[PDB]
Amino acid sequence: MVVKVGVIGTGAMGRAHIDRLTNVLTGAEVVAVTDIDHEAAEAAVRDFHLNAKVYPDDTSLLQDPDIDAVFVVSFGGAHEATVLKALDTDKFIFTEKPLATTLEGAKRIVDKELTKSKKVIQVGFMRRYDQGIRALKEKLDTGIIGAPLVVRASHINPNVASNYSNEMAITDTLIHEIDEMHWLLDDEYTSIQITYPRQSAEVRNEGLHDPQLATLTTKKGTVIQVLVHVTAQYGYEVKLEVIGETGELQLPNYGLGPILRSNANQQTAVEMSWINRFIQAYNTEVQEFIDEVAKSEPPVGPSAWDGYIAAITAAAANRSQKDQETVLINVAGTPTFYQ
Amino acid sequence: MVVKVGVIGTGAMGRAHIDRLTNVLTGAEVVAVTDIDHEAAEAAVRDFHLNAKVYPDDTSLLQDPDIDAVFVVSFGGAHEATVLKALDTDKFIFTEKPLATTLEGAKRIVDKELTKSKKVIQVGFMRRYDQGIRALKEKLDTGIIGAPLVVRASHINPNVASNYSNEMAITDTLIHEIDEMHWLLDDEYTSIQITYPRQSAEVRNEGLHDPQLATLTTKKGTVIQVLVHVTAQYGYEVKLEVIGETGELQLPNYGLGPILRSNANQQTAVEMSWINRFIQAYNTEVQEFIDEVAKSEPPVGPSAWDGYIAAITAAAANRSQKDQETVLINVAGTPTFYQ
Amino acid sequence: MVVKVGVIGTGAMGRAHIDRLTNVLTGAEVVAVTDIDHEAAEAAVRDFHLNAKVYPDDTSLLQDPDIDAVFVVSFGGAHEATVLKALDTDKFIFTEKPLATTLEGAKRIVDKELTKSKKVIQVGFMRRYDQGIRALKEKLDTGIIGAPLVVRASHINPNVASNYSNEMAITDTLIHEIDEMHWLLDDEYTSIQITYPRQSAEVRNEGLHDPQLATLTTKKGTVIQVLVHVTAQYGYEVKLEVIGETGELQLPNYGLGPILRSNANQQTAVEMSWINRFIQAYNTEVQEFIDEVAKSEPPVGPSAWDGYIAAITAAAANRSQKDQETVLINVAGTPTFYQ
Amino acid sequence: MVVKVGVIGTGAMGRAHIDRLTNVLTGAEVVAVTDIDHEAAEAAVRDFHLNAKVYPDDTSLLQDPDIDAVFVVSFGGAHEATVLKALDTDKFIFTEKPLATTLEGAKRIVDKELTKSKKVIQVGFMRRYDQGIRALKEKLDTGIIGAPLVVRASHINPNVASNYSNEMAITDTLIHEIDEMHWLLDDEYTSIQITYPRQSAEVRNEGLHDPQLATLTTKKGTVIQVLVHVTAQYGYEVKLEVIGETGELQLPNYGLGPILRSNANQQTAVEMSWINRFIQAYNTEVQEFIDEVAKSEPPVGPSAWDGYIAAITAAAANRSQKDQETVLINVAGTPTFYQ
Numbered sequence A, B, C, D: 001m002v003v004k005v006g007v008i009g010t011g012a013m014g015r016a017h018i019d020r021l022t023n024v025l026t027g028a029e030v031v032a033v034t035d036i037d038h039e040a041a042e043a044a045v046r047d048f049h050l051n052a053k054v055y056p057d058d059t060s061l062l063q064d065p066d067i068d069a070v071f072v073v074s075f076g077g078a079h080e081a082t083v084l085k086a087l088d089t090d091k092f093i094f095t096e097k098p099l100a101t102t103l104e105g106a107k108r109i110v111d112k113e114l115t116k117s118k119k120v121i122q123v124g125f126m127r128r129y130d131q132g133i134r135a136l137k138e139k140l141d142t143g144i145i146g147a148p149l150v151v152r153a154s155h156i157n158p159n160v161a162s163n164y165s166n167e168m169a170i171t172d173t174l175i176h177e178i179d180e181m182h183w184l185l186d187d188e189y190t191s192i193q194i195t196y197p198r199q200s201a202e203v204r205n206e207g208l209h210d211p212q213l214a215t216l217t218t219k220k221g222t223v224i225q226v227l228v229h230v231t232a233q234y235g236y237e238v239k240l241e242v243i244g245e246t247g248e249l250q251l252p253n254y255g256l257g258p259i260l261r262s263n264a265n266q267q268t269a270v271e272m273s274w275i276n277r278f279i280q281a282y283n284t285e286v287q288e289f290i291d292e293v294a295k296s297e298p299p300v301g302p303s304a305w306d307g308y309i310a311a312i313t314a315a316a317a318n319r320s321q322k323d324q325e326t327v328l329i330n331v332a333g334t335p336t337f338y339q
């Protein structure tokens, strides 16, 4: 039966999710929208030819009994309150990352969800759905390279908007690696440290350090070195290498485009848009959510607990940014509810 | 509104299309099925949880007024009669390849379709929807390597079933390149020639020559060299290189799986299944057809005319297979109906 | 002993051989040069800091008793007369390919050398010395991919000089593959056919067809498909793929230059000339020649017989060029002198 | 005229250099040897068919006026004393790494040589001569990727002998990166920090931590992250990536061996031997030294100053190994003598 969806926040990613649900994926319909910019919400309805009602706020939308699930796609800082409101209903909840912008907010959500008769929140950490990354994890898990010793990763982005701040290097960019690595390794973090190499001349934003180097450590002692470089110019790229005791695994170059021999070079295109890079993962993640809601079963994707882990680690990273010193992480054990 | 589909032939590929239409793609519903094996048809209904009627044959299914489009997914030899029957209705028609198993059957279909007010047939030549192959064509069409002079291609398959005949090297295997190349090059074929290199010791089928080399010439003068190797053992692989005046284009490695460094080698997995190789293409191809039907517009994918070109070329190749001599091809000018 | 060398022809490759003999290789000194362009000869002496005599012609240089060995590095069509003259002396002879530009010329050389007390000619078929190509042959010979069924090869040049003729597409270019494949496969040819794809707009030489396709068949039934493309623009490249019963072997991309990520592309440099692509092969073959001369022993590298065997096939291809028809080949057995 | 060489220390690398001078390269002759193991010295002369005198010690060898240059290939701890002695002569000096085993020893050599009328010492840091590494440096120096911000490198080795110590991870292994980076970047080091990920189960040596992570900083702010992994099992590999403001540069795939398609995989061999990996670099380095001596000009390769830089940095790294703390490095501005 069709999953009736309400969307809270009809901006860039909200519209992208509306588009997915309407024109790409199967088994859902958007029947309600709201945005603090009412005209934006109206436009979403028009642009996507929805049979949907526009509500003036989240509270009103959440009162609609016909809605089976809500998508929270507002500003990050608005997620916490909205998710908490939604938990007063029986509706399933897909929230874009972050779960909340503070670790305390995340904890509030976890604590509230724990009181319920079903897990209902999935968080939009799409990396876990990317076919390439999953294939690497699968291969790692065969034991073929032994224990993971070091992970080297890159998060490369061409340029940023004028409103992109230093802290967003963590909260908008590194956050993906923050969620991914503990999942990839089936391990828990023990520390994070952010260091600043020489400042790029390409940076146009006051206070923004770029590139940034992030070193994370895990309980088993695996060290993760992430390069974050958001004014890299050349392209958008995600790189991942796992160094094991007996071998290595790395993600192949992304892209299906041809190899060009021309002008004394052999070349392949590099993606310029994060949007295109993770199109598959976004579709897969959302389809999975919808498929679960259709069965009235709890989501199986990243949970509020994953959101909490991410928020704790992001907080630690933002602390590290202040003086470039290592910050310890010690997350509580995973409640059975979230296993 | 949803496109209501009837499926004629509920075998391996018929079920795969049903699965696509039901569980993967958007905007369609299978409401009717038929198969000469009635038990298979019934199973398809149960297996995919369809709300669908099982009909004794194609004729009866075709009388169902609720059906917007039919999928013809029976034995190749059955396609012609069914497509001709379907053309007595107003319904849209997706037929799997081949359009017909004979040249004359293909023309009968074309002649019949030409009598209609709009085009309704799409033929399942999915290569055109493969992202890698499409990306190559697109790059070619930028002019960046100048005019295409030579095409070198491979269709590699690990092993064949006992029913695989010499002529199937053309009709089941090369057929894909036959449809693909004239599209790739915006050109028309003038001849085809099949040669037999030394016979592989891996061949276990009566009368099968393997490998086979196919050489096609085009009106603009491009020479196409295809290696067909169906007992290759190592994997399933589709390779494509275009040699231009000022450069070359080739398909990259297919696969998202990781690069493994282990035991004095660096390695990546090779696909063993054509099914897996073309999952995406099948999805894109069918979604497009459904999207067209939903708008009541003619299909924009490979047409009955393309089916005809394929059939003519395949026939010529089968003739060449008899003595390894060149066989001329002179395809009629495209009717405006198919422009 | 330091081998005293004379060089006949001091153009691009003459200079390159002088360079290697003077600065890289051991046990040789260039003591004499000649070129029909006196200024070119003088430039070679100057540019490579030689204490060398500049002779007005080959005959005078050949009559200098102090010269131990001569290198024939003139225009291909000039090799025959020079080699024949040199055979009137007791000097060792390294000639670049081709041995001659006609079958009759090659035969004249063989007939003359057979009258001598020992073998003195080495032909510059350097492909056999290339580490990559050798490594491929070695792997093939392990049986890991079973019997070789088809070979696909490319011989790519960016452009040609004004003196490059249609006939030279065979005698200067394809001649490498002619020698290479029979060595690689330990097989002999039964036929050759040259075909002319769509003529490139990049051709600037009257009478030159480019690209050209060569199909060679061997006694064991292996079919070799060579692409000759000498106005390719993009670079200089040699490609080799062997299709076996149970697998494939391919030469990797050549180059040590870096991978550049820049401007929405990932790219690596392509060689623009043989001079660098085959520097190792040239070094090895020439050092081997010099080492034999130093011991007053016959060369162990490719012989005038190899040159003649190649010339037979080359002449067959030149015949095929006229009408694009297949030409049969059946070479004589190797004389004892050349075993 | 031929460069007459004396070799001090005729062990593994000593014999390798003798072989280079005797068989591989042009313009030199080994005319004297010495080793504390007088039988090793005798074996060298014998095995390589040398016309050389065996001297009882370095002092006696250095007094031989016919010797143009000496190679110091004894135990590392024995270089300092031997070098300082040779500096009492006018002979050119090629010393293997290290220049000295202490920065104090290195400083003494630097001070002594600085009193001489011209530079005579080259240190055997062969990385700088590796074609790929040089090609990358050169591309970097074009400015095409802007300023270097981060360098990521790997020094991967399959296994170690029973005598390999924790300190050797620096002195024998990382030392190559230690010399290479400041040269690559034309910059000076300001700090080094060694950190230990989880210990590999493959380690069989008391006290050896593997892998190790080395972080170096430069004056311009470039951060260098090196992974040292000496029990990696899979192969020997050197990886290098430079992250620039506007792009990236990395070393390409190393290897000439074929690509094998077999058994559901595509694979290429990985080098297992550091010896084989850097064969070319060793040859080029020594040939350049000989060429300089031949012209009676100072060496142009890595100098005593470079050896001093390496010694300081290695000492700092050995210190950091104790507690994983960052150790500052302050190298004096280069004397013009060494520019």
Ligand SMILES: NC(=O)C1=CN([C@@H]2O[C@H](COP(=O)(O)OP(=O)(O)OC[C@H]3O[C@@H](n4cnc5c(N)ncnc54)[C@H](O)[C@@H]3O)[C@@H](O)[C@H]2O)C=CC1
Pocket (backbone or CB within 6 Å): A008, A009, A010, A011, A012, A013, A014, A034, A035, A036, A037, A040, A058, A073, A074, A075, A076, A078, A096, A097, A098, A124, A125, A126
């Ligand atoms: N998982 C991923 O890779 C990505 C996640 N996101 C997340 O999606 C969320 C939205 O980002 P964008 O769409 O790019 O930003 P956006 O700025 O384009 O849109 C946000 C929308 O939310 C509306 N809004 C703000 N506060 C609201 C509230 N309290 N209630 C209702 N509506 C409100 C705004 O008016 C705006 O239309 C963010 O949390 C972002 O981090 C965004 C892009 C990629």
Ligand SMILES: NC(=O)C1=CN([C@@H]2O[C@H](COP(=O)(O)OP(=O)(O)OC[C@H]3O[C@@H](n4cnc5c(N)ncnc54)[C@H](O)[C@@H]3O)[C@@H](O)[C@H]2O)C=CC1
Pocket (backbone or CB within 6 Å): B008, B009, B010, B011, B012, B013, B014, B034, B035, B036, B037, B040, B058, B073, B074, B075, B076, B078, B096, B097, B098, B124, B125, B126
């Ligand atoms: N485009 C592509 O890549 C592919 C195309 N195909 C095409 O799909 C068609 C079906 O192939 P598969 O599903 O693999 O074969 P299959 O043998 O598994 O299924 C064929 C089904 O058709 C039924 N059938 C036969 N004659 C019929 C008729 N007159 N009316 C109704 N049903 C009839 C059979 O009972 C069977 O259930 C073939 O034409 C094949 O060439 C199949 C696979 C891939």
Ligand SMILES: NC(=O)C1=CN([C@@H]2O[C@H](COP(=O)(O)OP(=O)(O)OC[C@H]3O[C@@H](n4cnc5c(N)ncnc54)[C@H](O)[C@@H]3O)[C@@H](O)[C@H]2O)C=CC1
Pocket (backbone or CB within 6 Å): C008, C009, C010, C011, C012, C013, C014, C034, C035, C036, C037, C040, C058, C073, C074, C075, C076, C078, C096, C097, C098, C124, C125, C126, C172, C274, C278
């Ligand atoms: N093995 C290989 O990969 C290569 C082989 N070659 C061969 O080397 C030879 C020379 O080629 P390039 O140096 O590239 O050509 P080039 O055109 O640069 O030089 C040819 C030189 O020969 C001189 N010459 C012509 N006729 C002469 C004669 N009768 N006596 C003396 N000198 C004469 C010309 O004046 C010119 O200086 C050819 O046989 C060519 O096929 C050339 C390049 C690569």
Ligand SMILES: NC(=O)C1=CN([C@@H]2O[C@H](COP(=O)(O)OP(=O)(O)OC[C@H]3O[C@@H](n4cnc5c(N)ncnc54)[C@H](O)[C@@H]3O)[C@@H](O)[C@H]2O)C=CC1
Pocket (backbone or CB within 6 Å): D008, D009, D010, D011, D012, D013, D014, D034, D035, D036, D037, D040, D058, D073, D074, D075, D076, D078, D096, D097, D098, D124, D125, D126
């Ligand atoms: N640049 C590179 O990649 C490499 C550098 N090396 C360096 O080469 C040097 C020698 O290494 P190996 O040959 O591997 O060691 P090895 O132990 O095989 O040989 C050293 C030889 O020196 C002799 N010896 C020791 N002290 C001596 C003294 N005071 N005077 C004369 N002879 C003496 C020993 O008896 C022995 O025969 C070391 O400094 C090593 O670090 C070695 C291998 C590679």
Ligand SMILES: O[C@H]1[C@H](O)[C@@H](O)[C@H](O)[C@@H](O)[C@H]1O
Pocket (backbone or CB within 6 Å): C157, C172, C173, C176, C230, C274
């Ligand atoms: O003489 C050169 C030489 O034979 C090269 O190796 C070949 O690549 C060029 O085509 C030819 O003109």
